[model samples]
Target: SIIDQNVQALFNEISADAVFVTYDGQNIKKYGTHLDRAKTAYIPASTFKIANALIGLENHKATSTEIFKWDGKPRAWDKDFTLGEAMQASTVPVYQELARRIGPSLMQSELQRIGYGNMQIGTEVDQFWLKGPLTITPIQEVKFVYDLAQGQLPFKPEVQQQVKEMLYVERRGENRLYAKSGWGMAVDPQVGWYVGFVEKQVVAFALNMQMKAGDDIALRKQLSLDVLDKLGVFHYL
Candidate 1:
């Protein structure tokens, strides 16, 4: 009863059809009718940055304090970025260089080790998660976050902790939010995503939507908060 009522209210808030998956580090707690879509993979886009941060730190590709200086090529972002800065701004070039330096072989190996979806690098190593063959479902996305929280992934605990810290968005008392947003247009239909956990029992979630022109991208974050709020996630916190 609570789920249906909340789902309908959430559904009414968006212009695009979307699917969401919430895993509380154990079970599939809640999902939408397009649960099948949660299993259908799509380009992970910038959200791959989460795993990228892990790979970068785990392999010593870059340290949290290291700075990635802008290549002087014209871009919309700043002239440099640290691990935390790149994550905060979702800076693409910094991560693109980090992934390039990490190399395809190691990247693929690590992805496989982490049980990442498809693990396909497609044509270009840097572009794989952008438009290439690498893809993952909403379910897999949430699972990744869930495992990361429990230190179940192969990475060192401190490395995971640092990445999780970098992803921190908001914290209201004991209820913390750590998430990343992803946007891609390589496929005919573009996609947008927000995946992470609302702490205080680890209400981990992944949401993906078919992005149409004029869509309010911010809804990705708003609708998630609305759902979590309706679920009494914050109230309990």
Candidate 2:
């Protein structure tokens, strides 16, 4: 019953075929307008960054306190970044190098360890989540977030803590929200993703949409927050 009529009323406004899934520790809520799309996997886009942060910590590739010097590329971001900043900005160069440093074997092992998506790393470690091989359904994304929230993954609790902290989005009253947004820039038509959890009552969710010209990356969080607001999860806001 968690997936009720109001959910549909809200999602029906979106122009793209989208899948939104939410799970309170016990019940599951779904907007099935494009339900089958929930099971269909696509390149995970930047949403995979959450998992990358976990792997980076677990394998000692970096730590929350560690600083990563920027390669000095003429990009919009800062000249360097910490793991937290990288996660917050969804910095590709930062995570890409981390994945490259992580190498294929370890990346494959960590992905499999966490039961992440297709777990296929392809030939280029940095491009796998963006281009080929690694894919996860909307439902699977929610399930992974649920497990992480419950400390059910194979990762150490501290690793989970670091990942969650780095993902911190905002807080309203007693509820603290942590989320990540991803844009599948390499794909034709593009794909947008927003995935994370709400602390109080422990609701975890994932939303993905086909991106259009004006859709842009912001839609990922906008759509997700709209749903959360409608659901009363962030009622105090």
What is the C-alpha lDDT profile of model 1 across 56-145, one tens digit per residue? 999999999999998788885858889889997989888999899899999989999888988888658788988868989888899998
Error of 1 at 151 (Å): 2.0
lDDT of each: 0.84, 0.83
Task: List the RMSD of every prediction in angstroms.
Answer: 1.8, 1.8
The segments of candidate 2 whose C-alpha lies over 4 angstroms from its true place after superposition are 1-3
lDDT of 2 at 155: 89
Report the alpha-carbon TM-score of model 2 versus the true structure.
0.94
Best by lDDT: 1
- The TM-score measured for candidate 1 stands at 0.94
